[PDB]
Amino acid sequence: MFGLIGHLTSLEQARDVSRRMGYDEYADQGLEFWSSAPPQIVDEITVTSATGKVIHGRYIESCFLPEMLAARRFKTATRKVLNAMSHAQKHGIDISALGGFTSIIFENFDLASRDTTLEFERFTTGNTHTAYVICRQVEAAAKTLGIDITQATVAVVGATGDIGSAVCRWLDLKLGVGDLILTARNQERLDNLQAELGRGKILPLEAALPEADFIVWVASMPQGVVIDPATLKQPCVLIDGGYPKNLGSKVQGEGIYVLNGGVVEHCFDIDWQIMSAAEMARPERQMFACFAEAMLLEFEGWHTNFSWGRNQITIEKMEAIGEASVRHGFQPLALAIENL
């Protein structure tokens, strides 16, 4: 049994999903309502691999709301995630993914540090897979645009994050990228990253972007961030790989292509109503890679926290989850040539 732990996206979207959760669609549901709403298993899921193997999952609604952050209700926000995790476990789910804010939250509040104790091998961030997909997207994109990745330049914004640092290890060792630009907030970690890599030019954001054929956006987007279309190279690909994805609407311009990063398309229809179904071109087949990771671990029978902590993702783990991804019928989302 795999699990997909997710969360609401706005107060209005929660009222949409409200009824299906046993609640009154037209009642007063305030931030305080969803703060006290308990976690619920909400959707039963049956995925069928390309090999023929059938697996079963549960989508667990955590009721976390990004407004709980906005209202500085960080302990309430922490609680939602941990409850959701604890709910997964009591119902005997073997491996669950924390999608969207869920894992960001689990990290920035060191939640590794209720009734019973949580088994962490029962959960995964799905980040190893997310990093793997993001890298297949760079590779794919470069082939599509006629760009030798061996000569090209990739800026990894957030290169010190769990996802970002995994992307750099792969872009270096696997694609053999030409120039790798590192970008992040913490100078110390940027130094330690480039030391492990043996390469990479550390740069501030507004020097990074204009060198880059590919930009891998994988960090908490700062406030007052000016992305000026006009400074970017004229064939440019921006891979929005973090949660939430907002580049699609904050960056627009001729020869600029924004691509949802870390998204996968399955080979067969899946019947569900998940967390970002509304932002997927093809909801019945498209999902976050971190969720798909949870599925790959259950297809393979690897019941462990395959992805966990910060900067632990290794090339070898990325390799293993990658070919599990392919074998079971998952393709990276790709550029859609309606690019005019």
Residue numbers in the entry: 1 to 113, 118 to 344
Direct quotes from the study:
In this work, we solved the AARapo structure at 2.8 Å resolution, and modeled the complete AAR protein containing 341 amino acid residues. AAR is composed of three domains: the N-terminal domain (NTD, residues 1–130), the middle domain (mid-domain, residues 131–264), and the C-terminal domain (CTD, residues 265–341). Residue C294, which is strictly conserved in AAR homologues and has been identified as the key residue for catalysis, is located approximately at the center of AAR molecule. Above C294, a wide cleft that includes the dinucleotide recognition loop is visible. In the AARapo structure, we built five molecules, which show highly similar overall architectures, in an asymmetric unit. However, three fragments, namely Fr-I (residues R19–Q29) and Fr-II (S113–T120) from the NTD, and Fr-III (V221–D235) from the mid-domain, show higher structural diversity, indicating that these regions possess an intrinsic flexibility. In fact, we found that the mobility of these fragments is pivotal for the function of AAR, as they are involved in either the interaction with ADO (Fr-I and Fr-II), or NADPH binding (Fr-III), as discussed later. In the AARapo structure, this acyl-tunnel is broken by the side chains of M279 and M21. The N-terminal segment (H7–A37) containing Fr-I is more loosely packed, potentially hindering AAR–ADO complex formation in the AARapo structure. AAR alone adopts a loose conformation as shown in the AARapo structure, which represents the resting state (ligand-free) of AAR (S0).
